[PDB]
Structure formats: C-alpha cells, structure tokens
Design a protein around this ligand. Sequence first.
Ligand SMILES: CCCNC(=O)c1csc(Br)c1
Lengths: 300, 237
Amino acid sequence: MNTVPFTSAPIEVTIGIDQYSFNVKENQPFHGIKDIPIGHVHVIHFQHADNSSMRYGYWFDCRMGNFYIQYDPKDGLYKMMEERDGAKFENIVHNFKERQMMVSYPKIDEDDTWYNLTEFVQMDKIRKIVRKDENQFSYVDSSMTTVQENELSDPAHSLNYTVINFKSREAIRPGHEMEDFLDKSYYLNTVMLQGIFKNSSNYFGELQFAFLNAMFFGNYGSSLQWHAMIELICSSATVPKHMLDKLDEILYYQIKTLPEQYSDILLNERVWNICLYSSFQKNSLHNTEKIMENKYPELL
Amino acid sequence: GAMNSSNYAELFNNDIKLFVDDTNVYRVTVHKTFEGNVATKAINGCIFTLNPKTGHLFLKIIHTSVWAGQKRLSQLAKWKTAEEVSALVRSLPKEEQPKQIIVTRKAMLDPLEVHMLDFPNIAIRPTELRLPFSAAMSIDKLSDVVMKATEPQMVLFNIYDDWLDRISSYTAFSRLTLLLRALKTNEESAKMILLSDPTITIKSYHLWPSFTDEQWITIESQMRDLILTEYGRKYNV
Ligand SMILES: CCCNC(=O)c1csc(Br)c1
C-alpha cells in the first residue's frame, strides 16, 4: 500500500481520491492519503470551496515514483510533485503516519468498483493523451479541450484522444459510402482496432479514461469521446464476441458509478437510445440495458 | 445552413448551385398477388438536379434494373441519388462544379455529405421551402423519356425553355414553381389550362408551350386560380 502526502492544506477544498471524496477545512492539519492500492492507476482531484469553477486533478501510478501534493499560492492550486530522495520521502511519510494526519483509502474488501472502471487504463497511455513528458503523473481539468475540439486552442494543454469522425475519409472507403456509413465494422475493426489502437484493450483503456475524465472533471470533450467510442462499436455489425461481452461489463460499472444527479449532462440521450434499441448491438448489452432502464428510464 | 424565404434571392446570384430532388427516384405500383398478398413492381425513375439560375436540368434516369436483388430500396434510393449526383459533379469541369447543392428532403443530407467528402468546399444544404419538384413527372416530355428508357441514362434539358431571353431567372423560377405547384395540386386541370388553345404549340426543343408575354400572364393567373380553388375544394372554403 502506497501514500500521497501533503505539505499542508492552506485552502478549504474538497479532495477526491478515485471514487471517494472528503472535505478539508482551511489550514486543517491534513497531510495526505495513505493505504492506496498498488496495481491500479489512481486520480487525486480537487474542487476549491471558494471556487467550484475548475475541478482539476492528477492521474498517477505509485509504482512509477514517490508523489506528494504541495499547494502553490502563486498559481493558486494543489500541485502534484515528485520526490526524488527516496529516504526523505520514507522519513517524511512515516512521521505523518505516526502522527495520524492522513486519511486512509477506504476500500471495502468486496468492492471491485475501481478495478472495473480502470481495468484497461494504463499510465503510459494516459501520458500519450495528456502530453507533459517531464512529469510521471498527468494533470487534467474541467476546461481542457481535445485535439478534435481544436479542429472545429493551446495545443500543449489539450487532451489528445484518438479522433473518431463518422463522416470522414478515414471512416468511409471510396465506393463503400453507404455500406461503411450504415455498418461501421470497417472503421472499427480495420482502421481503429488493427490500425490505430492495435488491440481492443487499448481501445477500452481510452474509452474508460474518457469516461472518468467526464465524470470527475465534467470535461465535455471527454464525454464526447466516450460516447463516440461506444457508438462506433454499437454501429458495427461485426464485433468480436469477447469485445461485446467486455463492453457490456465496462458500461455497466460506469452507469452504476455515475452520480444520479449528473445523468442529465453526462449521458447523451441520442447515443444511448440508438445503442440500446436501434443499433446492430441492441441485443448484446444485457447488463448495461438492464441497469440503464432501472436507473435512468427517463433518458429512454 | 438551411434555405428559406429570407434568403430567396441567393438562388439567382452568380455562385453555381444545384437543387437535388429525389422524390421520383424509386417509384412503384402496388398490386395484389394471386394469393391475395400485396406486392410492389418498380417502374423507372429519375433524379431531378436543377440549376435554378440557368434552367439546366440534369435528368438522370433510374432504370428499374438498379433495384434488382437489392433490399431496403427506399434507403438505397437515397444513396443511389447521392452516388449519381457525386458522379455528375466529378464529370463537370472544375469551373462548372457547384459551390452549394441544396437537397429538397433532409433525408438526403447525410447520403450526399458522405458521397461528397472529396469536395469539402461544396456546401450541402437543406431548405424550408416546400418545392413542387415531385411534379416533374407531370411534364409530358420528361415522363416520356423516363418511361421509355431501357438502360441508365442522363438527359439534359433547359426547364425554362427560352424564357431567360425575356425574363430574369427569379421570374423564370417563380413561373416554374407555379406551374409545378399547379400540376401537383390538380394535374388534369393544370394540363387543360396549358393546352386548351390548339394554336399555341410546344416547340420540338421545348417543354412548355410558346406563350407570348401577354399569354403567360393569362396562364399564370389561371394557375393561381386553380391553386386557390383546389385549396377550397380541399378545405371547403
Ligand atoms: C520544495 C519542496 C519541499 N517539500 C518536499 O520536498 C516534500 C517531500 S514529500 C513532502 Br509532503 C514534501
């Protein structure tokens, strides 16, 4: 189990760690988060009490280094930093654990939620979508735009998701215009899976990461990306059976975890109704359709 | 975006544009089978592609063989239309290609957009005008060439005949749409109006009769009466 210590908490802030969150009061004696499960990526995220504008946060994997949070009063935010001195970090953390100034990552032992949300997500791929190569962790916030959004404006601060566009030359073979537009199996299986992503695990990793950025930060272009990657599978007549089975599990846990009160903005009525009721795969997503219908029947 | 009454003069400016109407591409008769079931038999169709400024009509005849062995023909019909319009544009010299294509039904937008991805600089637009181009098959010479075709074929017409020698393209389009609206609302009466007087003939190289200016005014008035009428007979007013 690993630890993300904090220098202090000078401003009142709601702190998220994966799907958990807690409130820290201004100058409260808070020095970090302990017992973080190894083996998974994680996200530590923030919403200031004085400005709910700009949720922001850091994707990290504790196997890749010793990270800590230090508030910056010039830039006005909690920054994730890396400690190179391993012995100073051990000495610094032990002191905080002895004085019991840390919150424990509160995982229930039955609970596979976080694994199920991040199964295919890898830090190395995160770092290719979020380009800032001098750091081992990745900063995301509510306002960052995607490469595709900038095409429709600071390129350094962008989310470089894989561009999916159903009315594009990449998606449509000359002379198969109708075939490829109404059955996107070519675009999914040949262009995206074999050509760009290489395998379905990398495809599902980006899909899961886009969902989590949409949910934790309200990042609008992430939500677009998540719905596009769902729709590309559902709009293909020919999808390997194992991918469909896994997609159903993936979406099921995403719908299960979504805050009930955010469904209106994070779920696209058109995509979901199309996917569950009109698409080639309308009959292939049993778990997802069942939870969608029992939890958000208004949307449908 | 969409085309409506507020930007009506855009049609007659000097940017090349084409209207595309697909309402006569897939045409059927419905009939009973020996077993008392119902079946369709297709008949020949046409794409109506019109330059509203010049009158040039690119009439692509759709022979029934194109449907043989195909499923979901009303959906295929929209994509066949888009394929044929795209082939037409590509056949035209660059300086003759349209800058906009306006479709008369919104269901043609995605089929045409996909077929024209190679032409990112051609705008594909809908319209809010209820244009009567479906009545094109009530023009005898157009219906005649469609029904006689034994193979796919493209036939070029000027739907304004020689009118542009005497009137603007705005007035010529207004005349065309009035004529076609009448033919759509009551074909027999419209056709009677156009041909009652045997001394006004249709030249071999024209579609409509050779009316003088004064005679077009009488004709146009008669077509309005018919349209207001039928609108009464319809709504009892
Ligand atoms: C200039 C940064 C000084 N603070 C540290 O090096 C440090 C390492 S773990 C924690 Br908590 C703080």
